Design an enzyme around this catalytic site. Structure first.
Site, PDB file in Angstrom:
ATOM      1  CG  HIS A  61      -1.707  -1.098   1.556  1.00  0.00           C
ATOM      2  ND1 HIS A  61      -1.491  -1.905   2.467  1.00  0.00           N
ATOM      3  CD2 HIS A  61      -2.932  -1.351   0.929  1.00  0.00           C
ATOM      4  CE1 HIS A  61      -2.486  -3.003   2.821  1.00  0.00           C
ATOM      5  NE2 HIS A  61      -3.131  -2.716   1.532  1.00  0.00           N
ATOM      6  CG  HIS A  91       3.515   6.049   5.316  1.00  0.00           C
ATOM      7  ND1 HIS A  91       3.654   6.201   6.838  1.00  0.00           N
ATOM      8  CD2 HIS A  91       2.346   6.712   4.967  1.00  0.00           C
ATOM      9  CE1 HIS A  91       2.401   6.604   7.156  1.00  0.00           C
ATOM     10  NE2 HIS A  91       1.763   7.151   5.994  1.00  0.00           N
ATOM     11  CG  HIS A  93      -0.582   8.624   1.700  1.00  0.00           C
ATOM     12  ND1 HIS A  93      -1.171   7.648   1.807  1.00  0.00           N
ATOM     13  CD2 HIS A  93       0.042   8.894   2.941  1.00  0.00           C
ATOM     14  CE1 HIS A  93      -1.123   7.112   3.220  1.00  0.00           C
ATOM     15  NE2 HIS A  93      -0.200   8.250   3.815  1.00  0.00           N
ATOM     16  CD  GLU A 103      -3.334  10.092   3.059  1.00  0.00           C
ATOM     17  OE1 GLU A 103      -3.206   9.931   4.192  1.00  0.00           O
ATOM     18  OE2 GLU A 103      -4.115   8.864   2.493  1.00  0.00           O
ATOM     19  CG  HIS A 116       1.444  10.864   6.564  1.00  0.00           C
ATOM     20  ND1 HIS A 116       0.334  10.152   6.184  1.00  0.00           N
ATOM     21  CD2 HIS A 116       1.090  12.151   6.346  1.00  0.00           C
ATOM     22  CE1 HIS A 116      -0.607  11.021   5.887  1.00  0.00           C
ATOM     23  NE2 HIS A 116      -0.138  12.395   5.844  1.00  0.00           N
ATOM     24  CB  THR A 195      -5.053   8.655   6.382  1.00  0.00           C
ATOM     25  OG1 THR A 195      -3.670   8.184   5.910  1.00  0.00           O
ATOM     26  CG2 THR A 195      -4.858   9.840   7.037  1.00  0.00           C
ATOM     27  CB  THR A 196      -3.854   3.316   6.211  1.00  0.00           C
ATOM     28  OG1 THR A 196      -3.173   3.181   7.325  1.00  0.00           O
ATOM     29  CG2 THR A 196      -3.175   3.808   4.839  1.00  0.00           C
TER      30      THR A 196
HETATM   31 ZN   LIG Z   1       0.260   8.338   5.702  1.00  0.00          ZN
END
Ligand SMILES: [Zn+2]
Length: 257
Positions: A61, A91, A93, A103, A116, A195-196
């Protein structure tokens, strides 16, 4: 089997994780015309001089850069926070195109990507206990725009070829996260969530106002990662972002005038 596709993306997550429709979900749109300056907010203290990365991992992901969080070494404090939060991983996005990928949004502006840096409150002893608490995590969010290269990112870029597919990991020592920070530590803050999945409402969000710049070549290397495992049909790891969720009964507070 959650993901970012047609059939398993954000709009489906509530079925396995009902808190997806909760009161404190992240990300959110940051309306700079309604976030109020809070003079009681403190400067952010980022102490990453002893941060020790271990390894980098493709989890299907995103990829996570990991830290040894067994000692008090890489900590976030001050800002909106009480007490001390220890860095465990970072990590990103990112998008398929430069016009999407973040995000959080800023007056509905989407950035090309978002970093993040995830920290857990040391008063709860470990990450797994921390995520069960409303004040368990502090996530430092940093926007990425495409322009100049970020020299401090290049070490991450150059290991991605070795973790192309889900479940691949590599040794990744001595990476300095200070090389990912913008000049200013001015921020917005609000209470929210991972957020996951599992989407737990355990995060004090600290979103920096100033983005970093990365080059098109750097982002293109992110976009060559795969969601799939080795020996499965190729699906590029792109658009691994959750869209903005309702703010509900929250205020976004600014550290700056
Ligand atoms: Zn994140």
């Amino acid at each position: 089997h959650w993901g970012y596709g047609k059939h398993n993306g954000p709009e489906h997550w509530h079925k396995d994780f009902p808190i997806a429709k909760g009161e404190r979900q992240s990300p959110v749109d940051i309306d700079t015309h309604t976030a109020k300056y809070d003079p009681s907010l403190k400067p952010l203290s980022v102490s990453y001089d002893q941060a020790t990365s271990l390894r980098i991992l493709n989890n299907g992901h995103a990829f996570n850069v990991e830290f040894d969080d067994s000692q008090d070494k890489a900590v976030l404090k001050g800002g909106p926070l009480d007490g001390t939060y220890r860095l465990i991983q970072f990590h990103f996005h990112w998008g398929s195109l430069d016009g999407q990928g973040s995000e959080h949004t800023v007056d509905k502006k989407k950035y090309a990507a978002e970093l993040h840096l995830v920290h857990w409150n040391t008063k709860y002893g470990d990450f797994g206990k921390a995520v069960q608490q409303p004040d368990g995590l502090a996530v430092l969010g940093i926007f990425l725009k495409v322009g100049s290269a970020k020299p401090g990112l290049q070490k991450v870029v150059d290991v991605l070829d070795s973790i192309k597919t889900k479940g691949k990991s590599a040794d990744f020592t001595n990476f300095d996260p200070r090389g990912l920070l913008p000049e200013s530590l001015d921020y917005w803050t609000y209470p929210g969530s991972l957020t996951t999945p599992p989407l737990l409402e355990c995060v004090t969000w600290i979103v920096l106002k100033e983005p970093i710049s990365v080059s098109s070549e750097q982002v293109l290397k992110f976009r060559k990662l795969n969601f799939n495992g080795e020996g499965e049909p190729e699906e590029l790891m792109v658009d691994n972002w959750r869209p903005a969720q309702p703010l509900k009964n929250r205020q976004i507070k600014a550290s700056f005038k």
